[PDB]
Symmetry: D2
Subunit: 316 residues, 4 copies
Amino acid sequence: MASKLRLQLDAHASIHENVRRLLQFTTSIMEANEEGIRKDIDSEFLHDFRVAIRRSRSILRLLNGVFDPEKTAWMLAGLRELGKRTNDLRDSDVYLLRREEYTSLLPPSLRPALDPFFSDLEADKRLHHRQFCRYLTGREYSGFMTSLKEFIAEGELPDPETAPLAAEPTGDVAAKTIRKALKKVLVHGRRTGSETSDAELHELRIDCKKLRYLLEFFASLFPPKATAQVLRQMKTLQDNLGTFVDLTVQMEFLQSRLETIPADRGGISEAAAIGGLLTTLYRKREKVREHFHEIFSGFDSNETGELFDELLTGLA
Amino acid sequence: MASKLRLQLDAHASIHENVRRLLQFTTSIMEANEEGIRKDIDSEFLHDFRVAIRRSRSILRLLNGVFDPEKTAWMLAGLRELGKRTNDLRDSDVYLLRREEYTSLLPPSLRPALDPFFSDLEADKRLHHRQFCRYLTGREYSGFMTSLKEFIAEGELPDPETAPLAAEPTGDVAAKTIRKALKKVLVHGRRTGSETSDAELHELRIDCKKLRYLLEFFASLFPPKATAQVLRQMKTLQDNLGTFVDLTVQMEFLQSRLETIPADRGGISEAAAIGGLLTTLYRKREKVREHFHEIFSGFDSNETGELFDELLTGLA
Amino acid sequence: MASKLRLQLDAHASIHENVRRLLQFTTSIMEANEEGIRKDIDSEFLHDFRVAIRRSRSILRLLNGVFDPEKTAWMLAGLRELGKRTNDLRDSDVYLLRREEYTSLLPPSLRPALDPFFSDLEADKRLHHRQFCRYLTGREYSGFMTSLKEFIAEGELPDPETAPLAAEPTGDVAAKTIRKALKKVLVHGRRTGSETSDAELHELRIDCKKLRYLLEFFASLFPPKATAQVLRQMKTLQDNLGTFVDLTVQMEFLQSRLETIPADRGGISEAAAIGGLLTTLYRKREKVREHFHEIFSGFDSNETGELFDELLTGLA
Amino acid sequence: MASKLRLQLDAHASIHENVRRLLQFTTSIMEANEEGIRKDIDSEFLHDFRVAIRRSRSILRLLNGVFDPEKTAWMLAGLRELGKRTNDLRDSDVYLLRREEYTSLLPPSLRPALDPFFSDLEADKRLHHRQFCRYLTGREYSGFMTSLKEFIAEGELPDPETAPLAAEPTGDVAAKTIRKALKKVLVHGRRTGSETSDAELHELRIDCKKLRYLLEFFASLFPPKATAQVLRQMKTLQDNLGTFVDLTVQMEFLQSRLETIPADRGGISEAAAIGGLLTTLYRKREKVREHFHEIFSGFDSNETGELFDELLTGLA
């Protein structure tokens, strides 16, 4: 319930006012999810907490200059540290949720060796849940969140010589940053020759995310159909890049677990099961890679250019 | 924004009161989505409209006896007719959204023959959108929705001899129907021998949906972690059955389009492209079928039984 | 050059005479391949040596009763022992030949862990080659082969009360055993319901091999087109069963290697690579299993019945 | 029985003498297969006939200069025309043999539409068999084969100024052409960047075939183990290129049939079935393409260089 909600923004208000409203929104989502994290109700609470952090940090970087550099660095560092504090707990949840999926991919002879693997994930989950709850109930977290909400409540415009973007009308900044983000997707996707490297796809996934975040933040400035059509136009490409990277992340996680499997007889069976998963995910990922070129060429169309022009029409 | 929202229910109120609150909720979602359907903002509006209808009808059947038989039949028939009125428009949206996905599956030589296919879908979409908007702005729709909201606002309990379930406490009905729905999933899944037929999987998908709908309707009666854990336990199985049936539905749609392709030279190329999609979806669906047995056996576990017992503890 | 060569048989000679000509043929192929085995020229020499053994043993069992029971048991036991003596050497050759195939299936991160695996196979190959060459140059092998060629050169018919089939005309025995072998394929394939178990497919593969061996042994008794058409009719089914079992055998080999991987850190990486291969072969094998029912139903046709009738016409 | 047979060559005889022995061999295989083609016993007879033609033409081009230019052109043109005369008949046989394979790939709903497709192939087969038998029994074929065997029986060395290679010792020509063919595989495979184009793979398949043909022609000049090891080293790469091109050829055949399917209602169903096959073969071919880079890099190794050096040692 964090990526599905939109703000009502005034296109004529300063970008400073509207980014502060964004951060009031995302910090409210953070705090609203603490109780569910603490009570370990469901994995979705930590996920929305993380989504709010990630969108906050990404917009703060895209709109660098709306706030003073010191305050910007401070918000980015505290939010980065907070997100990193959730990584181990988030990993435990995600791979536990994949247990039956992963088990079904393997031969029957290799399925039992995953049981100790998942029991160890459950033990990790309890450890990292306790650790992150002490963090959440701690003064250092309380202090950062209190300072952050106080700062974003400060409506006075910053020094324009150190925060040059702050006083700019929201519509102007939206037009300029969305055009910039679109150009970055198109240029980078066109640069993607035949090699279709891991690095290129990883970057382009982030390029598309930045574009999406901007569209969702500024949605209320545009006719709703126009925003919705641009988001739809991006979806197949984003799904291809997202699955490619997600499979990469899963393979990186499983590879790191191989490095710390016990070097003994029970480890051998677990290693074979983990190798089976790595290999199957690898094969899946190469099929996804095979489709990237067509899907991007279909995105890089005249209709796509026209839809962004129709979106941004009448802005400067 | 219809499948993600939960009601606050009183476990001690009559089931009649709480099912009326369900229907006030689902009808409100219906009406809230009319404007977006009419303005053709995005496909999600019709989807949530349909989800609200489908969950309303399914709960009304699961809880047959909360309302008088004539009123029950009337609500089911009007909601069925309303849903069926959305089918053609919904199909146009869904297969248009699949355009780049479908195009990427085919050899380059067959991709161009899909362009007239999708232009014809777009023409269908405009036709069915105009037709469904005249329906939405019509007196017959207005009249049904007005009568339905008036009926669900009538708080007097019905004749217990013709609506025997109405006066029952909500907690009792929840316990009995969730246990019944769970038993139906387990029995039917165990009956699924090696043949793993289309009919068996289609039925079991509906069995799982009924169970899920009941859990989501009655969620607020239980500790949140307990509800969330039961829903998570079901997810991999539901995803397997859901993909199996969804691929079936897509194949049935593409098969019906083959029957009406023009019997001429341009039709030949389109038919080859449609055959390529049918065949590829078929191959995907058989791999999904291959995983059903393992995924169900993993669902049909002692932990699953224990979680439902913990969910329903203290109820009768 | 053992499975591709046919004998010229006289349909009116006794089956005893013609099975002795078969065994003179297969033993000649055995001896002709010794030099290439000894000089380790290529893997094909041991393969043809094994093919000749396997076809000899299988026909001896199918035509039980052409020879006295003691001589039959003696030939079967000596040929079985000889074949088993080639298994380790044959395995080394086969999996060494699969090295690049296997390496290409794995993620880059798992490919290096196969290098010690294949170096150990090469060491095994040299060991088992030396062992089997001492065997080949030994008196015990020389003695068995000398006794076997002397026995098959003995043209006197055996005691008909202990070898009741020996004096039967070749055409009669061909007709009866080919019809019996065909019925066994059809019955067993029809018994294969939806479970399509490993045991059923393993058996049916052998049923088809026995039928093929009989057709190839008795080929010269029939019009060449008729034999060739029956063999072609069987091919797709035999290829499906053959790949199914071959993948099973490869998985069994890789599973046995997992059991003896060192329980230490270098073993962990090798185990992951072996698990990746096992899993990928497993997935391939389930797709092959998925096609069995259609392929068998296509073999179990009226045309197939008619072709065998045309093959055997005029015989009793 | 044409690609499996080797000549005994004298390394010190002129290349002219030994290429004439090659052509006596390949023409003998051609004539030996006429009867089986005429009686339509099995598809293998036309296949070996074609293999003999293809290897004859390829060696004649690789060793251009062993014969006078006019005689070389004459042999190449007559052999090319003869091979082309077999193409339609060969296609009928090959796709008829694929009937059950192709049928098993398709959804049940599309399988019946292939029956008229294969009945039409059978009708084509009978047509092209009758046509090619009139050709085989004709004076024009008889005359060419008589002239060809007379020419290859002419042992006098040709004019060295117009056939400069003829008098060269066989060992020298073998060393030079095998080294040249190997370099051409390695250079072209290394030039294959990430694009891995259809053209590049098609060419490299032919590069590998030329190398293989030379090794098999000159096999008896080298220690048998050395030849066998070089052929084994090439096998996985040749299998990858061979499957890639074979799938391409099958797709080209099915694409050409789409162009001539009747533009009417029965054609629509057949087109969908053909499109399903095209698409499935396409997907298979892209997976094969995905493995090319690894398989080639494994072939392009130090061991491969060393094995060719050991093969050619002591030659100039």
